[PDB]
Amino acid sequence: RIAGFRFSLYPMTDDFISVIKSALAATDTSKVWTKTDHISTVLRGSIDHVFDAAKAIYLHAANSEQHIVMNGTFSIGCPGDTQGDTYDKRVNEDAVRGLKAEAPCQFALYPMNEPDYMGLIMEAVDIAKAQGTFVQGVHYASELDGDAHDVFSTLEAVFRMAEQQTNHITMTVNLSANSP
């Protein structure tokens, strides 16, 4: 039951190559299997290590002070998922404990082959409301805001709630830092 995150980092700056390279390099990526291509990067591992890596990459990118966006898809349970392309402690948490970044976010939860999917989606919104990160609903997505630590905590709570109930789920996120 391997978790994955396929994401892209978008630096709105002439210095984009360096910004991406630095954010990935600055992160402790030792607990996730990674593959980068010219469109995106995929991370695979436990839920814990995938979310820990994803937050750290965002915080390092945001702390470039450039306008950057992280847009990706979390997935777990996909039918036929390989047992390979993988290799506890949130290895980045201490290192980034003093970093902050605002993380306004649009996200969408996709519980697959699930008759009660709209209910799982409503529970996701309820979790965001309880945690203080929910802003509003929009067409095709919900909106979160707050600091990255809180927004990533909400996103993980939602994903965990859903993956406990339904075999295959995905969840898109679109998180914007230093927006003009």
Binding site as annotated, residues for thiamine: 9, 41
| Structure tokens given for 147 | 């600091």
Work out which of 18, 30, 97, 118 binds a copy of itself, going by CB under 8 A.
Answer: 118
Question: What whole-number distance in Å separates Cα of residue 29 and Cα of residue 171?
Answer: 21
Site for a copy of itself in 123-152 (CB under 8 A): 138-141, 143
Determine, following the binding rule CB under 8 A, whether residue 114 of this chain makes contact with a copy of itself: yes
Question: Measured from the CB atom, is 104 or 161 closer to a copy of itself?
Answer: 104
Question: What whole-number distance in Å separates Cα of residue 55 and Cα of residue 151?
Answer: 9
Determine, following the binding rule CB under 8 A, whether residue 112 of this chain makes contact with a copy of itself: yes
Please give the order of strands across the beta sheet that includes 68-76.
Answer: 33-36, 41-45, 3-11, 68-76, 169-177, 105-111, 141-144, 134-138
Give CA separation, 56 vs 5, 25, 53, 69, 108, in Å. 13, 11, 5, 14, 21
Pairing label, strands 33-36, 41-45: antiparallel
Question: Measured from the CB atom, is 44 or 49 closer to a copy of itself?
Answer: 44
Determine, following the binding rule CB under 8 A, whether residue 113 of this chain makes contact with a copy of itself: yes
Determine, following the binding rule CB under 8 A, whether residue 30 of this chain makes contact with a copy of itself: no
Binding residues (CB under 8 A) for a copy of itself: these are 4, 6, 8, 10-14, 16-17, 35, 37-40, 42, 44, 67, 69, 71, 73, 75, 78-80, 85, 104-106, 108, 110, 112-115, 117-118, 138-141, 143, 170, 172, 174, 176, 179-180
